[PDB]
């Protein structure tokens, strides 16, 4: 992974949340870990990690709350504005915002801010040229709006300075958690089931996210009929992944799951 640290804020506005569900939700991640949350019901920006709560005061959260309530306001109008521009009424629609900064592996800094309507690219900031990139004709009026005045200047300033400044603080605040390594606990299972042996390898509770899980046959990497579920989250911030492979019944002994992860000094080999 090229990126060393990341700060990402996202938000969602919807016309059809579901019954009793908040129509607006915003959250923030540091190095992929959820550290703050707000929604249109609670109406409060709140801490989601101990290390953030331990290093912030009430005025900090009042400011985040104020910012979130403003973003909610903007989105409340937004849903209408964009429906109008797409000549739509009622139905299920969404507005999504995603922005933040990345500190890569040699000191390089990245900054982004992009929006989507009904889960499709709508518009994205191009801080290099200080313009906004319209994905569709319906975004042109927004582009025009945003390129007026000093809005673009402020957004660039936030992404390149403010965002980074705070990312480095957060990374400092929670380095004990964020910089830790949790060992995976692995299970290999087999199911005999239909003239086909299906072997399964599961790595439970590893951290950080990056991991490499492979099936070996007779010592050699394999390849065919391997299926992976990718990396999925646990409730506690650690991660989970499962890989399966189809084999011929009785060949169980020939297979090994191989796990490569930062927490392990040497790749782990697991048999059924």
């Amino acid at each position: 992974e090229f990126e060393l640290h990341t700060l990402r804020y996202i938000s969602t506005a919807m016309t059809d949340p579901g019954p009793g569900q908040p129509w607006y939700v915003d959250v923030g991640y540091v190095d992929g870990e959820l550290f703050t949350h707000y929604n249109s019901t609670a109406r409060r920006a709140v801490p989601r990690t101990e290390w953030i709560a331990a290093n912030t005061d009430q005025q900090y959260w009042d400011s985040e709350t104020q910012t979130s309530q403003r973003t909610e306001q903007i989105d409340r109008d937004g849903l209408g504005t964009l429906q109008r521009r797409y000549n739509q009424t009622g139905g299920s629609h969404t507005v999504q915002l995603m922005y933040g900064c990345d500190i890569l592996e040699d000191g390089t800094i990245r900054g982004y801010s992009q929006d989507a309507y009904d889960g499709r690219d709508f518009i994205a900031f191009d801080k290099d040229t200080m313009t906004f990139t319209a994905a569709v004709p319906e975004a042109v009026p927004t582009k025009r709006k945003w390129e007026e005045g000093d809005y673009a200047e402020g957004l660039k300033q936030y992404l390149e300075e403010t965002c980074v400044e705070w990312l480095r603080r957060y990374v400092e605040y929670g380095k004990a958690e964020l910089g830790r390594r949790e060992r995976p606990e692995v299970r290999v299972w087999g199911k005999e089931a239909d003239g086909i042996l299906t072997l399964s390898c599961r790595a439970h509770g590893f951290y950080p996210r990056p991991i490499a899980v492979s099936w070996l046959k007779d010592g050699a990497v394999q390849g065919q009929d391997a299926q992976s579920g990718g990396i999925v989250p646990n409730g506690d911030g650690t991660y989970h992944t499962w890989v399966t492979i189809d084999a011929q019944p009785g060949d169980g002994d020939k297979y090994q799951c191989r796990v490569e992860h930062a927490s392990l000094p040497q790749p782990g080999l697991y048999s059924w």
Binding site: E64, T67, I74, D77, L82, L155, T162
Partner: peptide
Amino acid sequence: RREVHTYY
């Protein structure tokens, strides 16, 4: 910290 963007 979050950053306020503006109206669509």
